[PDB]
Motif scaffolding. Structure first.
Motif, short mmCIF file in Angstrom:
data_model
loop_
_atom_site.label_atom_id
_atom_site.label_comp_id
_atom_site.label_asym_id
_atom_site.label_seq_id
_atom_site.Cartn_x
_atom_site.Cartn_y
_atom_site.Cartn_z
N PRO A 194 141.73 -51.24 -42.34
CA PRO A 194 141.78 -50.10 -41.41
C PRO A 194 141.00 -50.39 -40.14
O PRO A 194 139.99 -51.09 -40.15
N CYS A 195 141.50 -49.85 -39.03
CA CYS A 195 140.86 -50.00 -37.73
C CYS A 195 141.23 -48.77 -36.91
O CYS A 195 142.32 -48.72 -36.35
N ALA A 196 140.33 -47.79 -36.86
CA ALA A 196 140.63 -46.52 -36.23
C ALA A 196 139.54 -46.17 -35.24
O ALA A 196 138.59 -46.94 -35.03
N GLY A 197 139.67 -45.01 -34.62
CA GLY A 197 138.69 -44.55 -33.65
C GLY A 197 138.78 -45.33 -32.35
O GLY A 197 139.80 -45.94 -32.02
N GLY A 198 137.68 -45.30 -31.60
CA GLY A 198 137.60 -46.03 -30.36
C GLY A 198 137.37 -47.51 -30.50
O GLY A 198 137.40 -48.23 -29.50
N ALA A 199 137.13 -47.99 -31.73
CA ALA A 199 136.93 -49.42 -31.95
C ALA A 199 138.20 -50.22 -31.70
O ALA A 199 138.13 -51.45 -31.61
N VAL A 200 139.35 -49.55 -31.60
CA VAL A 200 140.62 -50.23 -31.41
C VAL A 200 140.70 -50.94 -30.07
O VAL A 200 141.51 -51.86 -29.91
N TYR A 201 139.87 -50.56 -29.10
CA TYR A 201 140.05 -51.05 -27.74
C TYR A 201 139.61 -52.50 -27.59
O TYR A 201 140.23 -53.25 -26.83
N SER A 202 138.56 -52.91 -28.29
CA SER A 202 138.11 -54.30 -28.17
C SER A 202 139.15 -55.31 -28.65
O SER A 202 139.30 -56.34 -27.98
N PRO A 203 139.88 -55.11 -29.75
CA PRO A 203 141.01 -56.02 -30.04
C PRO A 203 142.06 -56.03 -28.94
O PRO A 203 142.71 -57.06 -28.73
N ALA A 204 142.25 -54.91 -28.25
CA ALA A 204 143.29 -54.84 -27.23
C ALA A 204 143.00 -55.78 -26.07
O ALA A 204 143.92 -56.43 -25.55
N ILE A 205 141.74 -55.86 -25.64
CA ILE A 205 141.40 -56.72 -24.51
C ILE A 205 141.51 -58.19 -24.89
O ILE A 205 141.72 -59.05 -24.03
N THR A 206 141.38 -58.51 -26.18
CA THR A 206 141.48 -59.89 -26.61
C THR A 206 142.88 -60.43 -26.38
O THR A 206 143.85 -59.68 -26.25
N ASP A 207 142.98 -61.76 -26.30
CA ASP A 207 144.22 -62.39 -25.87
C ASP A 207 145.34 -62.18 -26.89
O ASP A 207 146.47 -61.85 -26.51
N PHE A 208 145.06 -62.37 -28.17
CA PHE A 208 146.07 -62.25 -29.20
C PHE A 208 145.53 -61.44 -30.36
O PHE A 208 144.38 -61.60 -30.76
N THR A 209 146.37 -60.56 -30.90
CA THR A 209 146.03 -59.75 -32.05
C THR A 209 147.07 -59.96 -33.13
O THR A 209 148.27 -59.84 -32.87
N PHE A 210 146.62 -60.27 -34.34
CA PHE A 210 147.50 -60.47 -35.48
C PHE A 210 147.19 -59.42 -36.53
O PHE A 210 146.12 -58.79 -36.52
N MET A 211 148.13 -59.21 -37.44
CA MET A 211 148.03 -58.14 -38.42
C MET A 211 148.43 -58.65 -39.79
O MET A 211 149.27 -59.55 -39.92
N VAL A 212 147.83 -58.07 -40.82
CA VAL A 212 148.17 -58.36 -42.21
C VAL A 212 149.08 -57.25 -42.71
O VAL A 212 148.92 -56.08 -42.34
N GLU A 213 150.03 -57.61 -43.57
CA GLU A 213 151.18 -56.74 -43.82
C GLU A 213 150.80 -55.52 -44.66
O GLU A 213 150.98 -54.38 -44.21
N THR A 214 150.30 -55.73 -45.87
CA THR A 214 150.25 -54.63 -46.84
C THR A 214 149.15 -53.63 -46.51
O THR A 214 149.35 -52.42 -46.61
N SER A 215 147.98 -54.12 -46.12
CA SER A 215 146.76 -53.32 -46.16
C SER A 215 146.04 -53.33 -44.82
O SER A 215 144.84 -53.60 -44.73
N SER A 216 146.77 -53.04 -43.74
CA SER A 216 146.15 -52.95 -42.43
C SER A 216 146.90 -51.93 -41.59
O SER A 216 148.10 -51.72 -41.76
N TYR A 217 146.17 -51.29 -40.68
CA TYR A 217 146.76 -50.36 -39.73
C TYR A 217 145.78 -50.15 -38.58
O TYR A 217 144.60 -50.47 -38.70
N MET A 218 146.29 -49.62 -37.47
CA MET A 218 145.46 -49.39 -36.30
C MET A 218 146.08 -48.30 -35.44
O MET A 218 147.30 -48.26 -35.24
N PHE A 219 145.23 -47.39 -34.96
CA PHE A 219 145.64 -46.30 -34.08
C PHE A 219 144.39 -45.66 -33.49
O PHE A 219 143.28 -45.90 -33.95
#
Ligand code: BTI
Ligand code: BTI
Lengths: 131, 489, 244
Positions: free
Chosen positions: B147-172
């Motif tokens: 999980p990755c929620a709240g305002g913490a989502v913004y730091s991955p956004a500025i990074t060059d590349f973001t990857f995700m794991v299928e079953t057990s991950s989400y972000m908003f």
């Protein structure tokens, strides 16, 4: 026949399917090497569809050994300068459930020579792979 | 001894330390800070202090090259950040700014820590500033394992590349509870911010992996491509492949009919070295392909259209994807190779209601601002402003090539014939469209003007690309002095 | 293998030892060139090699005068640090200091000026620094001898170290003005147990990690190899204004 056997495996075809598996299985069958056949041979030996014959234990072991050697050789390519490894202990298992975990070693004594064995402190065979 | 991790694995999930162990080399991880406490003293938090304080930061080493990393811990306080957690991350990023080393972070935080008050906001702001300042200096990669929620989502956004794991991950940004409170719709967490949603709909995630093990295995492969810093040169690896390998299958890829489609990968794969393509964003805006590849042992950037999907027509999403890829590639001195096949822009009201004018300008800005060596190959067609955008020779392009059956014209034959003869006698279609297409829908005119260097056989593409990319190794070009640009956002 | 470092530090806090027994194992064999060997013996400075590259060595010595900083030691260390930084030479320091030398002659001779020179030299430097705290570091002496806050790269401590504001007696005196007599026995021991240990300094984040004394060579070689390409710059100046 042996020539054909060997020559079938060296035919690289990519981009579409083919029937080379059927030819291989037919040639390797001991009935075909017995000496005589018939015209109803195919459907007699293939009642329901087609199903390729499987592998014996030693063939699957050899495939494991070659896979480990290939993995190590391609791994050493990515490392920079002399900071590269030369020995590992791998755990090979085909299938989605890890059927038959077989520990494997590798030593890479030269460019195309390895020292495959069961594990560390196990007798080594020194096969060869050129790829 | 397998203590205290049985509770984690029972839920079919891995631990932060296990992920770190899987990423780096077998025995080259040196944990930096391990005995740190939160010193909160509020809301009954004076007790239950934790030694690690929910973060694992170290140095490590991948493929003999240094790295820096950090990993969130879900067991301890849900991974919430604090005034104290962010200090370690800030120290790591500052050290990786002094030394030319990249940073990779595995995000798992459940949100901010409420018991610290505004100190969590302070830490978030510091991390955001470090990401903003150091973007373009050292490459930054982020992976989201939980999980990755709240305002913490913004730091991955500025990074060059973001990857995700299928079953057990989400972000908003905002949870579904607030959505139900205000709008009244009941949407699950996965339906809101699941990996598929960000892979296809929003375009934020640059990829998706099925397992953590595969994620690490391919993250190492991706890392093998990147340069270490801003000032370091592009890596070159040994390779047995050679520029003299025969590629004659390219003579037949393009069909002789102008309305039949083909797969651009059949052109991409022969030119590059064997089994050396790493597609970026494979499931989003499929009409354009972007990724990394090697040519004669050196990493390059690939951007090509695809007539398989929607006739290879430029769009909003494709423009954003290509613009981001070009900007990143140029920021770190990576050569760019492009393949061109475009009939124009996608026509529709929704497009203008969504701002095609802004988005389509981003790709043009990225192509014009770039100073790395560029190679362009026009296979079949290039019409209108799409020809200008896709790295035309006039945008300081180094070398441009065309194939013998290409077409470079202002627009399709029908529109030109219509505009060139207002009320000309009826049946003008048959004896005018054919003639105009014959006379001006061919690379001869563009070659006469000097817009393509030469017309080449499709079998010589690998030879020409290797020659040009070897010669252009030491180009030095500079833009006029600016504090920074003003890109159309 | 260097396992002899596990036994160098005595288990008593009032016994002395030779810092060379710590300096020699870490560096390569027969590669020390002491500078000014007969002057201000409470501090050692010189050149040495670590894995084939020359480095600078600055360490205290509890053998002479309990390893206490002074005027002459400050001048010696300041000159050595300035020269080493001027030519891009890494600096490795070993810390064992109870404070500054107390005496009227010291103030009549200007301890304030001279002691600031070493601090200025350590703060102005931009070469990679490695610091190891063996036993103790108190007061401003801890700040001066290349503390982590002075843009230090990596700092390490040994498991029996102590980092406190001052000795236990003075802290107990200042923290309890007219507390009941015999307060010595049940307060000094408790304060030394609770705060004269590297756990608090590690909690604050002032030391990277607490290491076994047998891993010092490994850690130093790793850090000095990684830090080979650091680029740091000070603000623009015609030149500094060091306290002469
Ligand atoms: O002839 C009528 C429709 C032609 C459209 C040709 C393609 S569709 C999208 C793009 N926009 C254009 O003007 N031409 C191309
Ligand atoms: O307890 C009374 C005397 C303690 C002195 C401890 C050493 S001597 C020089 C230096 N200055 C201090 O304040 N402490 C140390």
């Amino acid at each position: 026949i042996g020539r054909m056997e060997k020559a079938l495996d060296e035919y690289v075809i990519r981009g579409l399917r083919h029937n080379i598996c059927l030819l291989r299985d037919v040639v390797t069958e001991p009935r075909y090497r017995s000496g005589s056949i018939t015209t109803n041979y195919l459907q007699e030996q293939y009642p329901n569809g087609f199903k390729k014959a499987e592998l014996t234990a030693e063939e699957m072991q050899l495939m494991y050994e070659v896979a480990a050697c290939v993995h190590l050789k391609r791994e050493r390519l990515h490392y920079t300068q002399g900071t590269a490894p030369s020995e590992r202990q791998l755990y090979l298992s085909v299938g989605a459930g890890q059927e038959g975990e077989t520990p494997v070693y590798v030593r890479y004594l030269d460019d195309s020579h390895f020292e495959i064995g069961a594990s560390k402190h196990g007798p080594f065979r020194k096969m060869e792979v050129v790829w | 001894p397998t203590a205290a991790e049985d509770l984690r694995h029972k839920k079919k999930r891995l631990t932060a330390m296990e992920r770190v162990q899987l990423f780096c080399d077998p025995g080259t991880f040196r944990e930096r800070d391990a005995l740190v406490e939160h010193e909160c003293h509020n809301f009954g938090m004076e007790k239950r202090k934790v030694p690690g304080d929910g973060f694992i930061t170290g140095t490590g080493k991948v493929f003999g090259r240094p790295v820096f990393l950090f990993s969130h811990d879900f067991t301890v306080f849900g991974g919430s950040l604090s005034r104290t957690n962010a200090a370690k991350v800030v120290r790591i990023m500052e050290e990786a700014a002094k030394i030319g080393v990249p940073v990779i972070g595995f995000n798992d935080s459940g949100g901010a820590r409420i018991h610290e008050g505004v100190d969590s906001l302070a830490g978030y702001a510091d991390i955001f500033l470090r990401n903003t300042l150091f973007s373009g200096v050292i490459p930054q990669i982020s992976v989201i394992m939980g999980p990755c929620a709240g305002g913490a989502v913004y730091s991955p956004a500025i990074t060059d590349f973001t990857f995700m794991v299928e079953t057990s991950s989400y972000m908003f940004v905002t949870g579904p509870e607030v959505v139900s409170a205000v709008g009244g719709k009941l949407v699950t967490k996965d339906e809101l911010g699941g990996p598929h949603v960000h892979a296809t709909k929003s375009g934020v995630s640059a990829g998706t992996f099925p397992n953590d093990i595969v994620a690490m295995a391919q993250l190492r492969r991706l890392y093998s491509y990147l340069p270490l810093s801003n000032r370091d040169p592009v890596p070159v690896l040994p390779t047995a492949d050679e520029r003299y390998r025969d590629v004659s299958s390219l003579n037949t890829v393009v069909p002789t009919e102008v309305k039949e489609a083909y797969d651009m990968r059949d052109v991409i794969y022969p030119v590059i070295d064997h089994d050396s393509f790493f597609e970026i964003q494979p499931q989003f805006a499929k009409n354009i392909i972007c990724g990394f590849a090697r040519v004669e042992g050196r990493s390059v950037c690939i951007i090509a259209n695809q007539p398989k999907v929607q006739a290879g027509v430029l769009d909003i999403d494709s423009s954003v994807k290509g613009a981001r890829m070009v900007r990143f590639a140029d920021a770190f001195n990576i050569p760019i190779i492009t393949f061109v096949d475009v009939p124009g822009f996608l026509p529709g009201v929704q497009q203008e209601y969504g701002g095609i004018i802004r988005h389509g300008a981003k790709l043009l800005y990225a192509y014009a601002e770039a100073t790395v060596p560029k190679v362009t190959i026009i296979t079949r067609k290039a019409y209108g402003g799409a020809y200008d955008v896709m790295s035309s020779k006039h945008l300081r392009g180094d070398s441009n090539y065309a194939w013998p059956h290409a077409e470079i014209a202002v627009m399709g034959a029908a529109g030109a014939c219509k505009l060139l003869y207002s009320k000309e006698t009826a049946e003008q279609q048959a004896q005018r469209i054919a003639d105009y297409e014959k006379t001006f829908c061919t690379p001869l005119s563009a070659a006469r003007k000097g817009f393509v260097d030469a017309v080449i056989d499709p079998s010589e593409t690998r030879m020409r690309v290797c020659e040009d990319l070897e010669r252009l190794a030491r180009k030095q070009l500079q833009n006029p002095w600016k504090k920074h640009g003003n890109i159309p956002l």
